[PDB]
Each structure stands twice: as structure tokens, then as C-alpha cells.
Nucleic acid binder design. Structure first.
Lengths: 71, 71
DNA sequence: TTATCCGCGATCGCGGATAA
DNA sequence: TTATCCGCGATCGCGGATAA
């Protein structure tokens, strides 16, 4: 897990985790009660995605996050 | 830096960093080109804040973030 | 200093869908 | 399977502000 500085880097990181684990967008969406469409718009167009969507998808990916220094 | 699971925990964590360093919302807003109002709505009502706003404020706080396991 | 207001255009996530 | 569509109500971040 590298340091992440932008919505695009975040979405790329989380899509990679989804794919590495062989999960579909629909599977994740169902587990957390949002639309598959919403996961798709996040992976491809994350700039205006809400923090709520972000934290729900984190949960579905079995992830959390932490702050750290920009170094 | 603890693991964070929700927009509310994230906003509380970042407000604390802002305050511990003695920064005003206006100072941060100016450094990154957003409204002070936007920083205020994030600290108090983060659920629908955009990822963009989040990453810009991170920069102004000299922070980055990383993913990690939900444990 | 910060929470809060107006009016605005833009985009969210929603329900409900589809192609191939 | 996923990117993408419609129509919708809600909220974003914007410029520009204010109280105390």
C-alpha cells in the first residue's frame, strides 16, 4: 500500500484491490447497498465521488485507511 | 494516525491535525485555492464532501493517506 | 475566525435499466 | 460484467458575503 495523493490514484488503487481479489462491482455493491453504477463512476471518474461512497466501498473491499505525512 | 472507517472519523482526524498545528481554515483554503466555507462544511458535515476537496485539504495539511486492512 | 447565508451551474447517488 | 443511459431530488463547490 503506497501513499496516495489524488482521487485518481485512490480509484486506481482500489480497483486493483477489487480485481486482484476477483470481485465484481456488483458483488461489492450488493454487500454495501449502493448501485453498481456508483462503483463504476468512482473507478473511472472519482473526482466528485462523495466520501460516503468511498468509505462504503472500502468496507466492501475489507479495507480501512490512515493518514500519514505527505513526506 | 489510527485506522479510519467513516467520513466523520476522517473529518475529526483532519480537524485535529489542523488545530494541533495552529492553522486556520482560511490559511489552508488560501494555500490550495478553495473556499474557507468548503473546509468548514467538510469538518462539520463530511458525508457528501467530494474526494477532490478531501485530497486538496490533505495537501494543505501536509498529509497523504494510504489504504490498509480493515483488520 | 468560523459557521452560515444567497443564487448559481454542475454532479452526485438514487430507482430502473441496457448491450453484447 | 460493466460502462452507460433516463429522470429525479439533493447537495456539492463556486463567487460573494456576514456576525460578533
Amino acid at each position: 500500500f503506497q501513499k496516495i495523493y489524488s482521487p485518481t490514484q485512490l480509484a486506481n488503487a482500489m480497483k486493483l484491490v477489487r480485481q486482484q481479489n476477483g470481485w465484481t462491482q456488483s458483488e461489492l455493491a450488493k454487500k454495501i447497498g449502493i448501485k453498481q453504477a456508483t462503483i463504476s463512476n468512482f473507478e473511472n471518474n472519482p473526482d466528485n465521488t462523495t466520501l460516503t461512497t468511498f468509505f462504503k466501498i472500502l468496507q466492501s473491499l475489507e479495507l480501512s485507511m490512515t493518514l500519514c505525512d505527505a513526506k
